[PDB]
Amino acid sequence: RYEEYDL
Amino acid sequence: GSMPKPINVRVTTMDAELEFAIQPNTTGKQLFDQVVKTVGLREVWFFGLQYVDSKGYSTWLKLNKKVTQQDVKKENPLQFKFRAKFFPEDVSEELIQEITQRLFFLQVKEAILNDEIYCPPETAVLLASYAVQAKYGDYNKEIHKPGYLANDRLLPQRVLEQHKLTKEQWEERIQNWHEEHRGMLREDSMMEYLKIAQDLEMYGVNYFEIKNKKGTELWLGVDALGLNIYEHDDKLTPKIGFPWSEIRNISFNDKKFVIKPIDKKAPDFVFYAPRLRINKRILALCMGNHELYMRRRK
């Protein structure tokens, strides 16, 4: 699937 | 009526073995905390527990889930490896306990002798001499006779294949550096080793095989400082660097990974992993490393 990390 | 069904587990460090029982509802964090309690380690943020899944895939145990609910393999004692997942930016500043230093030393030395970290031959020899001083203590000509290093695994195989000398020449060079360490405490030795190893270009880098849109095979590195892209034939020196301070956002969808820059003028970087699992491991390492990077700068 999909993931994000925004920092 | 009924009874509890305990679960035997085995946890190894680089130099120790632990065996005890857990419960069907025991969390990974509870297992982790009992491991570090028994060996007296407080610098725990570097470490994780490694296991093998039902299909033989190496995996970091998730501490917020139950130990028995992560497809750990069937063995009457479950088998875990307590290892460093993250590496400090500076060993002399960040590794305070002697247990932590020794465990990093043992793990890094294993990686070097397994040809994971490219090492120039004279560096490899200096590395071995510190490992000799830590193991044997002070050189003594009346105790360490010629050939005293003959059965020691001392150098990485690929150092031996490129620089051609005889077995005894290598050991004589290593012995010559052993002599000059006549003052060095065992604990001080392993730190000098680490101080040398940590400056190697491949030290502390997690490498993954990837491609770009046109299909060129590249290497993706994740380390304490950010991300790097390498050409297929050079894992030493990045071709493109992605320090944390330049990255605004990393994300993936299935196999497509995207790195977005803080400077909108720069182009997004996109690469493709072979499996979703690869991108998940890349992101867990990115988030872990970025977190430790931030904490050091508070």
The strand pairing partners of B243, in sequence order, are: B226
Mind giving me the DSSP string for chain B? ------EEEEEE-SS-EEEEEE-TT-BHHHHHHHHHHHHT---GGGEEEEEEBTTS-EEEPPTTSBGGGS-B---SSEEEEEEESS--S-HHHH--SHHHHHHHHHHHHHHHHTT-S---HHHHHHHHHHHHHHHH-S--TTTS-TTTTTTS--S-HHHHHHS---HHHHHHHHHHHHHHTTT--HHHHHHHHHHHHTTSTTTT-EEEEEE-TT--EEEEEEETTEEEEEETT-SSS-SEEEEGGGEEEEEEETTEEEEEESSTTSPPEEEE-SSHHHHHHHHHHHHHHHHHHHHHT-
- What is the Cα–Cα distance from B188 to B181, expressed in whole angstroms? 10
Q: Among B173, B84, B189, which Cα is nearest to B133's?
A: B189
Sign for the pseudo-dihedral over CA of B66, B67, B68, B73: positive
Tell me the chain A residues in contact with residue B290 when contact means C-beta distances shorter than 8 Å.
Answer: 5, 7
Nearest Cα residue in chain A from B254: A1
CB B97 within 8 A of CB B41: yes
- How near does any CA of chain B get to the CA of A7, in Å? 6
Task: Note whether residue B12 is domain-resident.
Answer: yes
Contact between A5 and B283 using a beta-carbon 8 Å cutoff: yes
Nearest-10 Cα torsion for B283, B289, B293, B294: 50
Considering B84, B99, B123, which residue would you say is the last residue of a domain?
A: B84
State the CATH number of the domain containing residue B140: 1.20.80.10
B170 and B132, same structural domain? Answer: yes
| Cβ–Cβ gap A2/B290 under 8 Å | no
In a domain, B282, yes or no: yes
Query: Would you call B287 and A5 a contact, using CB atoms and an 8 Å cutoff?
Result: yes
Residue B1 within a domain = no
Cβ–Cβ below 8 Å for B248 and A1: no
What Cα–Cα distance (Å) separates residue B214 from each residue in B217, B253, B282?
Answer: 9, 18, 21
Regarding whether B239 and B181 lie in a shared domain, the answer is no
Residue B93 makes CB contacts below 8 A (sequence gap 6+) with: none
CATH, residue B77? 3.10.20.90
Q: Is residue B62 part of an annotated ligand binding site?
A: yes
Question: By the 8 A CB rule, do B244 and B182 touch?
Answer: no
Distance in Å, alpha carbon of B263 to nearest chain A alpha carbon: 14
Integer Cα distance of B239 and B251 in angstroms: 21
The approach used to solve this structure was X-ray
Residues in A 1-7 with any Cβ partner in B closer than 8 A: 1-7
Per the structure, the count of domains in chain B is 3
Q: How far is CA B73 from CA B56, B76, B81, in A?
A: 8, 10, 13
Determine the Cα–Cα distance for residues B242 and B263; give it in Å rounded to an integer. 12
Q: What does DSSP say about strands B78-84 and B7-12: parallel, antiparallel, or unpaired?
A: parallel
The alpha-carbon gap from A3 to the nearest alpha carbon of chain B, in Å, equals 6
Adjacent-strand bridge partners of B220:
B208, B229
The answer to whether B248 contacts A7, with C-beta atoms less than 8 Å apart, is yes
For A2, the closest of B252, B286, B287 (CB atoms) is B252
Which domain range does residue B157 map to? 91-197
* Assigned domain for B26 exists: yes
Q: Are residues B71 and B155 in the same domain?
A: no
